[PDB]
Design a binder for this molecule. Structure first.
Ligand code: AGS
Ligand code: AGS
Ligand code: AGS
Ligand code: AGS
Ligand code: ADP
Ligand code: MG
Ligand code: MG
Ligand code: MG
Ligand code: MG
Lengths: 304, 346, 312, 316, 448
């Protein structure tokens, strides 16, 4: 079994650092539940622990995601089919990615079935869910664990599984997947298969996390800082030939532009271009051309 | 001989040897995960995939066949796809079904999952469903892929062979081990060329192999083809060979030079004819745009290159939204003519 | 227990509110046996499925209501037309004399071929079965089909009309409603009595008292002060410290960028700008919304929004 | 039970169809000589396709209309089995008609037949053309497979000009003696959009609900965004006055008009408006862009406000 | 006297020398005639098949060709249309016992002639649930037959038919050239007493896409309009004019110009907008190029609206498209058309792209040893190097062309059809293939 589930909480008041959610989940016998929070903060783990506490190990809850490709009708149809411990629990993941018209229909389905099934909407934004669904639900914020806790639990995992990783390795593991304990644990697991347990250096983490090294970002800014278009072509060609996706380059380039000492006008222009390039890439545009364009804008902004 | 010297075992790879040892350790440990292998074209993604399969199952993964399955759209427009299959895996490209890529994924995953339930005992308890060219799947299809990847996780593993994962939904990137296959260095290409020619017993010199590498632009398949094609014409290998390039490279280059020469509508019509001759041979419009833009930038001024780069990026973006690529290609050309003439004249 | 959206349903035809013209015309149709096929369209929760049900209960009896009224939802399924509908419209009911009634709820989820088939069915049997279609987007209905039947737009309820019914509900029940809790309920409802009564009941049942704060916390609607804070960070701060502040607030409470952007638009129109600056803010915010509609990173779109406000 | 005006005043001969003088002229020629080909009448709704085919079939056959005509609507079973059995046995059936007359198989809503049915209908059309003629009607003339269009004359129909709808409306008013006024007739012609059956339905519904016909009353039964408000909003956008155009826009949004409806009316009003020409085109460009973005699904008020901002900043 | 017959039936090809499409040495009808005449030797290089597959565009003469061919040689055929149920059970219960049987037309004729054949027309109509399992039983019948089966299709590039072409002599009807149909229809219109200018005839033949049945029906309707006393090219020419449409046209009229044939008008405009000389740009090429770029931008906007309308059947964006693709370019290019509103010519290019696509895909699937890419230029460069590989031995030495052609053809699992495909596939700019640049090719086809 994967480590993302082998080390899940088995009880409600057991390890979940969030206190005001584990207290109410005892009285959960406001008909429905609504969890929201950043990804990988024990959203599904907590309700699964609550369901294994309430129902029991053999009494086994339909979990499906509301972001299906097959429309919304099949979702509510499956809920109806599952409808027929005086109730059953259905879990809706990514419930914020439902359009308002699809939440209206899920509202009708969940309010006509409000006698035998309890719902749990798991999302990352409570504002995306419309006011009927939230008004029928009881909200619960899930805040990520503190950085030190993250490293603590990761060391606990690495000692329970005998994975020889440096402490700076753990620091970089939690830094490379920011505040995402699920992602950090999955990386720790899938980065020890990649070595056979001999040694897990930060290069393996940087490769698995898909993070382009900060050297290449500094090279991109060194080229666009002052130089002809040939340097931009060269650095972009080298960055594409390395395999690094353009999404990661745009992400890290934005992260560097925002929290540096560029002017407000320059930051504004560069970030507008970053957003446009990000949409262009999300629309299937070609990475080389979009990166060339973005670098041309950044160059005409910095060089001036 | 491109298919005659490609290695077949992970210990036989020519470059990225640390990654090779890592992949060998991966297939050696239990619970082989879903792999997402990516990297620029012609870097060795398929070679590494075939080596992973040779390490995963027996050598019986080479005795493959070619199955022709038919899918049915949400209407009577029936489509036929080509699945290269072996006794332990299945390699389908679920993108030839232009916008019906959501049903092929579901059905193929289902069929492989049910065939693995028929006494799969050779060495593993799962099959491999290699989907090539994944970054061009529609979002409604990548969502189905995400769903049916866990729905049948226990019986079939997926290896997504894309490049530049930028257009892969994070729901998938979060469920696949990301294997990144960079393009081999110039020296790596030179060494593999020298090795191939020495196994061939040829006299590949040290100044021609480097020209082949620099012209191939980190593409190993292009370099091997260029080496094979400079032999079919002039066996003795000297320092200044006229190493050939493919037909469409030349065509696209002369088309760009023609755009640069004249700036008249009578020239724009001939450029439209050239773009039609290029599209008809089924070369992607993104390749046309990048190859045209390069040779164009070679013939502009440093002050104009910014506008031309942004124009190419803009037009290419829009082309990925419409249906008739010739419209946007000709628009880009017309715009570049109207800009370049106004720049040169003034 | 029993929801208030059902306990206070208008049982008769006059207990409907805010549609006196439409209600009077339908009542005149009933009195003169001139009832045509009806197409009731408008935003949710405005009183369509209650108007036609009151009209039915006024037209038939309660025992004829199973054999002369076909209440059919159109979101379950071209076969539904030539199936139960054509077999209901063409046949008489044995001992009852008079037309039948077919009520197609959600009549805009029908494919266009189904609407062609249904239009021919309607055109054929138009003197023993009256159709009453019900939809939210009249634009989704084929112009052919809509041509057949008289159309009634059930727009939203203005707050003057709907406040007396809420006051009657409050007095009949025991709800200690503040003088602005009614206002923050009317505002959040946005003119559909169903959502107003639902929000009111759920908040009164969860917290025990309704006010301008309790309803805003029960529905998770972004408070006005928070959006004022965000606009102040954008308008009177450095770029980076605004990015930091806005991101911290956006992750503190559950807040996306769509809702931030909507409320910030309303504020851009509220506060005073030189009227050549809000043309820029409006253009850029309407581009950021389109960019977010395609599934992009919100960390680069939020920064784009701050860039838009940094024209000042 | 009195039947509606859409039927009480249905033209019973092709001299009374006001739609498309050229195509109806062709069809009168065919009703005179008598050897019709398989015809596919295609065009927008409400323009007189079913009526034209029915009047043509009547004028051709005459009293043998009960024996020589087979009509199959969209509400009838028209699968491959019906096409292979009923339509074929009717084509083979013997009916003795005058020299140049043929049996007629009217397949109304021909775009609703599945491909298998049309494939099964091809050879029935081709073989028995010596005694059987087909007359299909459709709106989307591309839903009919190509081999069926290859053996039919594709007669195109177009929307009606405002003068033709006005003539027929006056012919009906004269017979019904309904009190009217010019603004009411202009309102009906604006709400019709060419559909001659929509216009008659609106006329009858307005007259039966209220009697007198005036624009104030026409927009009480149709009830779409009053074109005067949209004209005023576009006027404010011409003077680069965003704060006064967003006023009208938010007013329209308050009454719950769906943004598709608001854009439809804004387009239809900005097309026949009184601006300059280049400025009108620059406006229609942006309105089309925003219509695309709304049909795609981004239908919030922010997009309408952005459209207004662009329209304003086109005129500096 | 009134005529109870269409033109499509009055002027049908009663003989074999009257098929307008093909009257040549080796054409679809003579190839079939020679395959049928000596079919007995089976039980062109098609004498090894037991069935023919006439395929091609509609209205070109497939049905007439097969009937007249089977009728000239004295054959007697049993036609099975798409209006006859052909499911597996029905097919193997109707036509199974007739394939290996003698026809009674072979004994009792009203002269007497054997050689009974079967004609399976509209074989791509054997789809749906009604004809469940038709194509499978049909190939199972073709495999064990004793009379010539003549199958007719309509698009050889069909999923169900792709499993059938492997058993059928593959004929392919071409759209007849405009001059042939022009001569024929002019003779017909002369027989009928109808005078039409040859330009209008070329317009009619092109608008109907060289579909002889459609041009005959259009001539019937033309004569109908003549007795009663606006086409695509005409409206396509009316959008780029100046001098007469100043007060005659408004935005409603210019937008309506699109609505005449809204399915083809944007293509006509995108094709013919480049041959205009903007009156606004009085010879100043710097402004003429700018007008061209602006018109191209507008046409791409029209393409965006088109691709949006196609996906979801949202016919409310038709006016927006009419603004982007037909009215705007009009105002931008408002000069004077030079020559003529030529045909859009995009449909033919799309069809040829689909052909080249499937050709390359098939050739690449056979090269599936350990390498494959569905249809990319990856294979276009493997196949360009394969073409230069193959032609080299024979260019330099006649004696090694056979040895190498076979060695490669069998190393990558290729055939003679694959050779022909790989040769005239990489000819850029109408450049002759490096295989026609003599005596060895004759023995090359015979010895392979
Ligand atoms: N507060 C917490 N208490 C206990 N375990 C935690 C906590 N936060 C994270 N975890 C661990 O992290 C893992 C992931 O938590 P999940 O509930 O799967 O996160 P998530 O909400 O599913 O994120 P998604 O599904 O990608 S949106 C579990 O295996 C837990 O062991
Ligand atoms: N005009 C009204 N008068 C009185 N109660 C009303 C009125 N409109 C809505 N309601 C109340 O709101 C509830 C829902 O109204 P409905 O008629 O069901 O709305 P609706 O038009 O059916 O919305 P849909 O079906 O989702 S489009 C009813 O149970 C009533 O209690
Ligand atoms: N051109 C016309 N001249 C006169 N009356 C017309 C005309 N078109 C429509 N009508 C009237 O509208 C009624 C219905 O028109 P139809 O012939 O049904 O139009 P249609 O082409 O069938 O529209 P469809 O089938 O919905 S696409 C007729 O009974 C006439 O009264
Ligand atoms: N080559 C031709 N020469 C003369 N007349 C032709 C020719 N092709 C078609 N026709 C005419 O068109 C009619 C129909 O042609 P067919 O051969 O039946 O078409 P088809 O090839 O069967 O097309 P399908 O079956 O729809 S794919 C005949 O009756 C002729 O009048
Ligand atoms: N390790 C290697 N040693 C020798 N040749 C290789 C190696 N890796 C790749 N190649 C060459 O590249 C060719 C194909 O590249 P491929 O593996 O398909 O990468 P991609 O999938 O990115 O095109 C092989 O036929 C071989 O010629
Ligand atoms: Mg979860
Ligand atoms: Mg309702
Ligand atoms: Mg009709
Ligand atoms: Mg035929």
């Amino acid at each position: 079994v994967p480590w993302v589930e082998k080390y899940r909480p088995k009880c409600v008041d057991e390890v979940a650092f969030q206190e005001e959610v584990v207290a109410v989940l005892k009285k959960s016998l406001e008909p429905n539940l609504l969890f929201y929070g950043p990804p990988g903060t024990g959203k599904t783990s907590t309700i699964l622990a609550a369901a294994r506490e309430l129902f029991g190990p053999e009494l086994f809850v339909l979990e499906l995601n509301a972001s299906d490709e097959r429309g919304i009708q099949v979702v509510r149809e499956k809920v109806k089919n599952f409808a027929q411990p005086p109730f059953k629990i259905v879990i809706l993941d990514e419930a914020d990615s439902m359009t308002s018209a699809a939440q209206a229909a899920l509202r009708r389905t969940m309010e006509k079935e409000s006698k035998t099934t309890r719902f749990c909407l798991i999302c990352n934004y409570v504002s995306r869910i419309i006011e009927p669904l939230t008004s029928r639900c009881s909200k619960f914020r899930f805040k990520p664990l503190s950085d030190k806790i993250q490293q603590q639990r990761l060391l606990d995992i690495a000692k329970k599984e005998n994975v020889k990783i440096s402490d700076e390795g753990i620091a970089y593991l939690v830094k490379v997947s920011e505040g995402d304990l699920r992602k950090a644990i999955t990386f720790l697991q899938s980065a020890t298969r990649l070595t056979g347990g001999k040694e897990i250096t930060e290069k393996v983490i940087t490769d698995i996390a898909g993070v382009i090294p900060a050297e290449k970002i500094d090279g991109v800014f060194a080229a666009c800082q002052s130089g002809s278009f040939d340097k931009l072509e060269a650095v972009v060609k080298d960055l594409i030939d390395e395999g690094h996706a353009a999404t990661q380059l745009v992400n890290q380039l934005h992260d560097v532009v925002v929290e540096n000492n560029l002017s407000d006008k320059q930051k504004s222009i560069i970030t507008e271009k970053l957003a446009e390039v990000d949409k262009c890439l999300a629309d299937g545009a070609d990475e080389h051309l979009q990166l060339i364009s973005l670098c041309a804008t950044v160059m005409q902004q910095l060089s001036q | 001989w491109v298919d005659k010297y490609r290695p077949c075992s992970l210990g036989r790879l020519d470059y990225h040897k640390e990654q090779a040892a890592q992949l060998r350790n991966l297939v050696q440990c239990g619970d082989f995960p879903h792999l997402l292998v990516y990297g620029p074209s012609g870097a060795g993604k398929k070679t590494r995939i075939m080596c992973i399969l040779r390490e995963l199952y027996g050598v019986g993964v080479e005795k493959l066949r070619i199955e022709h399955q038919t899918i049915t759209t949400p209407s009577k427009k029936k489509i036929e796809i080509s699945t290269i299959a072996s006794n332990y895996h299945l390699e389908v490209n679920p993108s030839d079904a232009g916008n019906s890529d959501r049903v092929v994924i579901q059905e193929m995953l289902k069929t492989v999952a049910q065939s693995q339930q028929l006494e799969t005992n050779s060495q593993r308890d799962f099959k491999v469903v290699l989907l090539t060219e994944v970054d061009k799947l529609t979002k409604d299809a990548q969502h189905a892929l995400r769903r049916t990847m866990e729905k049948y996780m226990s019986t079939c593993r997926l290896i997504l062979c894309c490049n530049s994962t930028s257009k892969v939904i994070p729901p998938i990137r979060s469920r696949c081990l990301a294997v990144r296959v960079p393009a081999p260095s110039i020296e790596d290409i030179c060494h593999v060329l020298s090795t191939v020619c020495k196994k061939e017993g040829l006299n590949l010199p040290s100044q021609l192999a480097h020209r082949l590498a620099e012209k191939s632009c980190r593409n190993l398949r292009k370099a091997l083809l260029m080496c094979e094609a400079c032999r079919v014409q002039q066996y003795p290998f000297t320092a200044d060979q006229e190493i050939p390039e493919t037909d469409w490279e030349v065509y696209l280059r002369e088309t760009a030079n023609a755009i640069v020469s004249q700036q008249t509508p009578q020239r724009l019509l001939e450029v439209r004819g050239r773009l039609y001759e290029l599209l008809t041979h089924c070369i992607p419009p993104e390749i046309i745009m990048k190859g045209l833009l390069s040779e164009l930038l070679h013939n502009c001024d440093g002050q104009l290159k910014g506008e031309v780069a942004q124009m190419a990026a803009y037009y290419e973006h829009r082309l990925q939204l419409g249906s008739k690529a010739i419209y946007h290609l000709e628009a880009f050309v017309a715009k570049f003519m109207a800009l370049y003439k106004k720049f040169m004249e003034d | 227990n029993l929801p208030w959206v059902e306990k206070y349903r208008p049982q008769t035809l006059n207990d409907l509110i805010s549609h006196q013209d439409i209600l009077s015309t339908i009542q005149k149709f009933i009195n003169e046996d001139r009832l045509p096929h009806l197409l009731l369209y408008g935003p949710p929760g405005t009183g369509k499925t209650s108007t036609i049900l009151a009209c039915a209960k006024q037209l038939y009896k309660d025992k004829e209501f199973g054999s002369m009224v076909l209440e059919l939802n159109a979101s379950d399924d071209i076969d539904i037309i030539r199936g139960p509908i054509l077999s209901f419209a063409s046949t008489r009911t044995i001992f009852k004399k008079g037309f039948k009634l077919v009520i197609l709820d959600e009549a805009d989820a029908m494919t266009q071929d189904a609407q062609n088939a249904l239009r021919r069915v309607i055109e054929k049997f138009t003197e023993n079965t009256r159709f009453c279609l019900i939809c939210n987007y009249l634009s989704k209905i084929i112009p052919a089909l809509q041509s057949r039947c008289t159309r009634f737009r059930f727009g939203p309820l203005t707050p003057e009309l709907m406040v007396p019914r809420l006051e009657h509900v409050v007095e009949e029940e025991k709800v200690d409603i503040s003088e602005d809790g009614m206002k923050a309920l009317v505002t959040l409802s946005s003119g559909d009595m169903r959502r107003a009564l639902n929000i009111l009941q759920s908040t009164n049942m969860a917290f025990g008292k309704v006010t301008e704060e309790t309803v805003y916390t029960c529905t998770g609607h972004p408070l006005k002060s928070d959006i004022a804070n965000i606009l102040d960070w954008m308008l009177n701060q450095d770029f980076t410290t605004a990015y930091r502040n806005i991101t911290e607030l956006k992750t503190l409470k559950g807040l996306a960028l769509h809702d931030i952007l909507t409320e910030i638009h309303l504020f851009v129109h509220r506060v005073d700008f030189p009227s050549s600056v809000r043309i820029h803010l409006l253009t850029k915010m309407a581009d950021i919304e389109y960019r977010l509609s395609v599934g992009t990173n919100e960390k680069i779109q939020l920064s784009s929004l701050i860039a838009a406000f940094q024209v000042t | 039970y009195e039947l509606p005006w859409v039927e009480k005043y249905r033209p019973v001969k092709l001299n009374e169809i006001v739609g498309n003088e050229d195509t109806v002229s062709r069809l009168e020629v065919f009703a005179r000589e008598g050897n019709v080909p398989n015809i596919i009448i295609a065009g927008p709704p409400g323009t007189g396709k079913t009526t034209s085919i029915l009047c043509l079939a009547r004028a051709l056959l005459g009293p043998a209309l009960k024996d020589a005509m087979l009509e199959l609507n969209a509400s009838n079973d028209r699968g491959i089995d019906v096409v292979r059995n009923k339509i074929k046995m009717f084509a083979q059936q013997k009916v003795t008609l005058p020299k140049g007359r043929h049996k007629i198989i009217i397949l109304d809503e021909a775009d609703s037949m599945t491909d298998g049915a049309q494939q099964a209908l091809r050879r029935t059309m081709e073989i028995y053309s010596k005694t059987t003629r087909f007359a299909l009607a459709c709106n989307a003339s591309d839903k009919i497979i190509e081999p069926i269009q290859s053996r039919c004359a594709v007669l195109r129909y177009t929307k009606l000009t405002d003068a033709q709808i006005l003539t027929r409306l006056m012919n009906v008013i004269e017979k019904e003696r309904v009190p009217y006024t010019d603004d009411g007739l202009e309102a009906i012609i604006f709400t019709a959009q060419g559909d001659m059956r929509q216009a008659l339905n609106n006329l009858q519904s307005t007259f039966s609900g209220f009697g007198f016909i005036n624009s104030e009353n026409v927009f009480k039964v149709c009830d779409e965004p009053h074109p005067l408000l949209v004209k005023e909003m576009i006027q404010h956008c011409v003077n680069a006055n965003i704060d006064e155009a967003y006023k009208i826009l938010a007013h329209l949004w308050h009454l719950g008009y769906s943004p598709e409806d608001i854009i439809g009316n804004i387009f239809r009003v900005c097309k026949t408006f009184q601006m300059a020409e280049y400025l009108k085109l620059e406006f229609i460009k942006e309105i089309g862009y925003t219509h695309m973005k709304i049909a795609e699904g981004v239908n919030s008020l922010l997009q309408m406000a952005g459209l207004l901002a662009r329209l304003c900043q086109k005129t500096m | 006297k009134v005529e109870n017959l269409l033109w499509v039936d009055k002027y049908k090809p009663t003989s074999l020398k009257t098929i307008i499409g093909q009257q040549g040495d080796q054409s679809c009808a003579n190839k079939l005639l020679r395959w049928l005449r000596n079919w007995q030797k089976s039980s062109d290089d098609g004498s090894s098949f037991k069935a023919a597959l006439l395929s091609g565009p509609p209205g070109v003469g497939k049905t007439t060709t097969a009937s007249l061919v089977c009728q000239e040689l004295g054959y007697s055929y049993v036609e099975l249309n798409a209006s006859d149920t052909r499911s597996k059970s029905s097919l193997k219960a109707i036509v199974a016992e007739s394939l290996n049987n003698t026809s009674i037309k072979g004994f009792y004729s009203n002269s007497v002639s054997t050689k009974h054949a079967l004609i399976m027309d509209e074989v791509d109509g054997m789809a749906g649930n009604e004809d469940r399992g038709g194509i499978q039983e049909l190939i199972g019948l073709i495999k064990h037959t004793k009379i010539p089966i003549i199958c007719m299709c309509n698009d050889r590039n069909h999923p169900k038919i792709r499993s059938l072409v492997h058993y059928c002599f593959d004929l392919r009807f071409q759209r007849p050239r405009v001059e042939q149909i022009k001569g024929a229809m002019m003779s017909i219109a002369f027989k009928e007493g109808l005078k039409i200018p040859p330009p209008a005839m070329n317009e009619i033949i092109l608008g109907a896409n060289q579909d002889i049945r459609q041009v005959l029906h259009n001539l019937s309707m033309w004569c109908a309009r003549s007795k009663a006393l606006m086409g695509p090219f005409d409206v396509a020419r009316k959008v780029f004019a100046a001098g007469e449409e100043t007060a005659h046209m408004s935005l409603v009229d210019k937008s309506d110009l699109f609505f005449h044939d809204y399915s083809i008008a944007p293509l006509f405009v995108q094709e013919n907008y480049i041959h205009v000389k903007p009156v606004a740009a009085g010879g100043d090429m710097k402004k003429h190029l700018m007008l061209l770029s602006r018109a191209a931008d507008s046409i791409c906007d029209g393409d965006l609206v088109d691709s949006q309308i196609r996906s979801k059947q949202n016919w409310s964006l038709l006016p927006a498209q009419a603004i982007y693709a037909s009215v705007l370019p009009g105002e931008l290019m408002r000069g004077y058309m030079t020559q003529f509103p030529t045909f859009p010519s995009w449909l033919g290019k799309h069809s040829s792209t689909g052909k080249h696509d499937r050709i390359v895909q098939d050739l690449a699937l056979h090269m599936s040893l350990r390498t494959y890419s569905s249809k990319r230029t990856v294979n276009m460069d493997y196949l360009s190097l394969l073409r230069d590989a193959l032609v080299q031995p024979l260019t330099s030495q006649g004696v090694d062309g056979v040895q190498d052609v076979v060695a490669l053809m069998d190393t990558y699992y290729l055939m003679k059809e694959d050779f022909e495909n790989i040769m005239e596939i990489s000819s850029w700019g109408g450049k002759p293939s490096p295989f026609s640049k003599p005596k060895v090719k004759a023995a090359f086809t015979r010895a392979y």
